[PDB]
C-alpha cells in the first residue's frame, strides 16, 4: 500500500496539519499562510510526485518564522512516519537542477541521522513577503525531525526566486529517488549495520 | 548468466583471492587482514549489490600497504574479467553520497583506459589501525588493473571515517550504475569506436 | 512585599503604561503596537519570571522608533522604582543563552550608572515588520533610565529572530539573577561605598 | 521520584545499554570498551551528579567510531526519556570550567531542537588510544537524540586531555544546572509557546 | 564551624599578617601600605562575603612590588589552610562582572594545581600610585600558594581602575561560588580521583 | 649527611614512590610504567649525579598522562624535601646541552616560586609510545611542587628523541649545579631577603 504519513501539531504560536504520500501522483494541496512557501511546496509535489497536503495557521503578525519552522518540523515527522524501517528503498538521492541561471545540487541520505549542509547565498532579503533566511530554517527543521542527511549546494544563481525554487526542485527529485523502491535489493534494509 | 570474475595471486609479500559477481545481491564476504578495509568492502557489497568475496594474508607487520595494494589489484582484475567486452552496459556511472557532514562525488567510465583523479584530504593519519594514505592507493591500484577512468571528489567532510566511507558508498553506487544493463542499447558496445 | 514599579508617560509621539513585578511568576501582558517586541517582552516574563504589563500606542505610521524607545524608557524607570535602594540583592547577573545556532552573553550590574556595551550584528533589516536597529535602541533606552551597566555580546548566530530572542532570554535570566535576593548578605546594600 | 532514563540498542556494529538518573548522587558506572571515554563519563557523573550506568561492546577492531557514536546516541535518548515534558526545570545551563591551562565554555538549552556549535581544536590525534575526532562526534550524536541545543567553545588550552576533560566538566555542570528544578516556576513548562 | 585561615610571614623585605573567613559576612579590614590594593581587597570582602583581615608593612620606598607579592602569597596560603580537603564544596567558580565599560571574566577551579591564565591589558602604568603590572603579580602569587587554577579574561575595558576593580569583583564572586557548599554532594570530595 | 627526599602518594588514578639523593653517585632506578620516561630519568641520574629511585603504577590504559603527572609532582616534592632551607647552595643553574642536532638551554633558580618557561616544539606526536605533550607537563608539575623557577629553550633540533633527551641532560646539569655547595658562601642562605 501507499506510504502515507500524517502529523497534527499545535502550540501557542502555530497550528499545523500535514499529510504526505511518498507513492503519490504529485497532488499539490498546500496552504501555510506563507504564499511563497506554498509555491515551493507545489514544486515538491510536481517534481517529486509526492502528494502534499499542508494546512497551517500561526503568528505571522510577529514573523513568518514560527509558522515556517513548525510546517517544516511536521513535514519531517510525516516523512519519517511514511518511511518506516526503510525496507527496499534506494535510500540515497542525488540531483542537480537549474532554474535559468540558478543551479542547485542536492544530495541526501535517509540515514536516520539528522544533518544539514547548506551554502546558499540568497542576495535579497525578501522574495515577495517571504524572509529568505527562512529557507535554511525550513530545511534544517525538516532534517531534524525526519532524521535525514541533507546537503544543499549553490553552484550558480543570482535571482532569489530562481535560487530557492531550483533548490526545491532539486530536493524534490533527490527525495523522490531516495524514497523509491530499489528494484534489486528485494525488500532488505539498505544498510550494512541492520 | 551472472557476470563473475575470479582472481588468485601470490607474491613473497601477500596471498590474495577475490571473487566478484557484478549481478549480485550484496553478499558481503571480505577478510583482508585489514579490518577497516573489510568494513569498506562491505559498503561496496551493500550499496553496489555486488557479491564480494575476498581473502588476503600478507606482511602486515611491515605495513598494511602491500596487502591493501594487492587486494585492490586483484579486485580490479576481477572486475575486468567479469565485464568482458562490456556489451549492453551503461558504461558510465555518476553518484554523490553523503555520510553525515562528508559528501563525496564519484564519476567513472568503464573505458579500458586507467585514470584516477583524486582530491580527498583525510585529516587524520590512522582510522582505527588503518593508514589513511592507503585509501588513494586502493583506488589507484583498482583503476590500474580494471582499466577504469575514475574521479573521486571531496565536496565536504571532516571525520576521516565519514570521508572514506562516503567515498566507498558513492563508488559502489557509481560502479553499480556503470555495470548495469542499459535497457535501450540492445547489447551493443557503448562506444563510437567499436 | 513584592517589588512593583509602575510608570505612565505620554508625549505628542506616544502613550505608554508599564507595570513590572520583580518578584513575579512570569505573567506576560505586553501590547506595544509592535508585535515582535511583544514576543520579546514575553521572553522577559517567561524566562525572567517578571510580571510584565505594558500598554503602548504611538506614531507607528512614521516609524516604530518612538514607540520602541518610549516603551524601553518606561520599563527602565519601572525597574528603577521597583528596585529602590537595592538592599539585599545579588546586584550582578551573568548568563549566556542560545537559541539554536545563536548564542548571546549578557552581563549586567545594577550599579546606578548607565552603560550599554553592545556588539550584535543582525544580518537582516526587518524581522517581520520590526526594524532590527531598534533592538540596540531598546536596550540603550532601558539602561539610560534604569541606571544599569549592561553588556550584550554576540558569540554566534545567523538567523535574526534567533539572535534577538536569545538576547532577550539571556537578558531576562541575567536580570532575574541580579534582582533576586542574595541569601547571605542580610539586607545590606551590595557595595563597598554605601 | 527520581528521573531515570534507560535505553538498550543493538546493531550489527555495537551493543549498548545506558541508564541515567538526572537526580543522582554521582554514581559512576561506565564501561564502553573505550577507556578514555569511560574517564570522561566519570566526570559527567562526578561533576554533574548524574548516576551514569553504561555498558557497550562493539567493533573496536575497525575503529572506536561506531561504539563511541552508539553510546552517545543512547545517552541522548536516555536524557530525553528521563526529562519528559521538562516541567519545572531551569532548562538552560551555562558554565565555563578550566583544567589547568584549558578553559572550555558550555552553554545549553533543553529546547527539543538539536544543534551543536563546536570549535574545539585538539592538537593531537590520539589521547591514549582514543581518536580525538570522536569528541565532536560524541556531542553531536548526544545532541541529535536528546534534542538539545549545545554550544562548546574553546577559550584556552594546549594539552589534549585537558581540553577534552575540561569540556566534559563544563558540560556536566551546565547539564546539571539545566536539568535541576527552578525553585520559582512552580512546575510550569519553561517556554512561552506551551 | 567557619573556615578560617591565618598566616603570618616576615622577611627582610616585608611583614605580613592575613586572616580570611570563607564563611564570612564581608568584613573588610585590609591595610597593606598600598591604598589601591586595600580598595581591591575591600571588593573581595564586599562581593565575595569573605571576612578579610590584612596587615602589611614593607619596603615600599624601593617598590610596592615586594609588599604586593608577599600579601598575595600569604592570602593564597590562608585560602589553602581555610579550605582543607575541600569536602562538600562547589570547587568551580565562573563569573563575569562589569564596571561600566569594563567587563572581566573569571573562571577558577580549586584543584590543588596552580595555574594563572591572564590577558588583561591595562592601558596606564599607574592607578593612583599603584603600578598596574602588580595586578598580574598579585593573582600569580595568590595562585602559587593556594594551588588554584585561575583564568582572568578581559572582554572589554578602557579605564584602568575599572578594569582592575571589575577583575576583583569577578574574582570575588567566582571564589565565593567555588568555596560555597554544594547542596547535593553530601560532603564528598568533588573529584573523580579521591 | 646526604640530602635525601622521599615521597609516597596514591590516588584512584596512580600510585607513586620516589626517593632522590641530591648528593648521589648517579644511581639510576626508575620504573614508571612509561619506558621513555624511565630513559629520561636515567639521564637525570647519569648527568646530574642524583640517585633516582622511582616506582609508579597507574591508569596507562586511559592515557600515560596521570602517571606522568603524578611522577613529576612527587619528584618535585622530593626535591623540595631534600633541599630544606637551601643553606650554602649555588641556587642557580645554567646549562646548554646538545644531542646531535638538538640543542637545549636550561636555566633554573631554586627560588621557592614556581614558574615554567617552555618553548619546545617537538615535531612528532609519539616517541615510541610516549605522547610528546607530556614532556611539558612533566616539567610543569615538577616545578609546581618543587617551587622552582625553570626556563627551557629549544635552540635547535629536529629529532623528537634528541630534543627531549637533550632537555633532560641540560636540566640534569643545571639542577646539579644549583643544588651543589657554593664553596664561598659559608652556609648562608643565597638570598638578599633572608
Ligand atoms: O548507518 P549506515 O548504513 O550508514 C553504516 C555506518 O557504518 C555508517 N557510519 C556512520 N558513522 C560511521 N560509519
Ligand atoms: O573510447 P571511447 O568510446 O571513449 C571514444 C574515443 O573517441 C575517446 N577518445 C579518447 N581520446 C580521444 N577520444
Ligand atoms: O559603586 P560600586 O559599588 O561599584 C564601587 C566603586 O568604587 C566603583 N567604581 C566606579 N568607578 C571607580 N570605582
Ligand atoms: O521554543 P522556545 O520556548 O525557545 C520559544 C520560541 O519562540 C523559540 N523560537 C525558535 N525559533 C524562533 N523562536
Ligand atoms: O584532579 P581532578 O579532579 O581535576 C581529575 C583529573 O583526572 C584531572 N586531570 C588532570 N590532568 C589530567 N586529568
Ligand atoms: O627571593 P630572592 O632572593 O630572589 C629576592 C627578591 O627581591 C626577588 N624578587 C622577587 N620579586 C621581586 N624581587
Ligand atoms: Cl561540483
Ligand atoms: Cl567569551
Ligand atoms: Mn527557529
Ligand atoms: Mn516560480
Ligand atoms: Mn605501493
Ligand atoms: Mn562505518
Ligand atoms: Mn531615538
Ligand atoms: Mn520566537
Ligand atoms: Mn559516524
Ligand atoms: Mn584526567
Ligand atoms: Mn616578584
Ligand atoms: Mn573603585
Ligand atoms: Mn594534567
Ligand atoms: Mn636516548
Numbering used by the authors:
A (entry chain A), B (entry chain A), C (entry chain A), D (entry chain A), E (entry chain A), F (entry chain A): 9 to 202
Manuscript text:
The program of herbicide development described herein aims to identify inhibitors of imidazoleglycerolphosphate‐dehydratase (IGPD; EC 4.2.1.19), an enzyme of histidine biosynthesis in plants and microorganisms. This enzyme catalyzes the manganese(II)‐dependent dehydration of (2R,3S)‐2,3‐dihydroxy‐3‐(1H‐imidazol‐5‐yl)propyl dihydrogen phosphate (2R,3S‐IGP) to 3‐(1H‐Imidazol‐4‐yl)‐2‐oxopropyl dihydrogen phosphate (IAP).4 IGPD shows strict enantioselectivity for its substrate, with the other three diastereoisomers of IGP acting as competitive inhibitors of the enzyme, thus indicating that the active site shows some flexibility to accommodate inverted chiral centers. Previous studies have shown that IGPD is inhibited by triazolylphosphonates, whose potency is based on mimicking key reaction intermediates. In this paper we describe work on the lead compound, 2‐hydroxy‐3‐(1,2,4‐triazol‐1‐yl) propylphosphonate (C348) and present a series of structures of IGPD, from Arabidopsis thaliana, complexed with a synthetic racemate of C348 and with the enantiopure compounds.
In this study, weak electron density was observed adjacent to the chiral center of the lead compound in a 1.85 Å resolution structure of our target enzyme in complex with a racemate. However, as with the electron density for C348 in the 1.85 Å structure, the density at 1.1 Å resolution was also weak around C3. Nevertheless, a small peak could be observed in the map around C3 when contoured at 1 σ, the position of which was consistent with the binding of the (S)‐C348. Refinement of this structure using tight geometric restraints revealed further difference features, indicating a second position for the inhibitor, which, from the geometry, could only be interpreted as resulting from the binding of the (R)‐C348. This finding indicated that in the crystal, the active sites of some of the enzyme molecules were occupied by (S)‐C348 and others were occupied by (R)‐C348. Subsequent refinement of this structure with occupancies of 0.6 and 0.4 for the (S)‐ and (R)‐C348, respectively, produced a model which fully explained the electron density, thus indicating that both enantiomers of C348 were bound to an essentially invariant enzyme structure. The two enantiomers thus trace an inverted path between the metal binding site and the phosphonate binding site, whereby they are related by mirror‐image packing. Both enantiomers retain low‐energy conformations with approximately staggered torsion angles, with the largest deviation in the atomic position of equivalent atoms occurring at C3 of the backbone, thus explaining the weak density at this position observed in the complexes of IGPD2 with the racemate. By extending the resolution and chirally resolving the two enantiomers we confirmed that the areas of weakness arose from the mirror‐image packing of the two enantiomers of the inhibitor in the active site, an observation not without precedence.
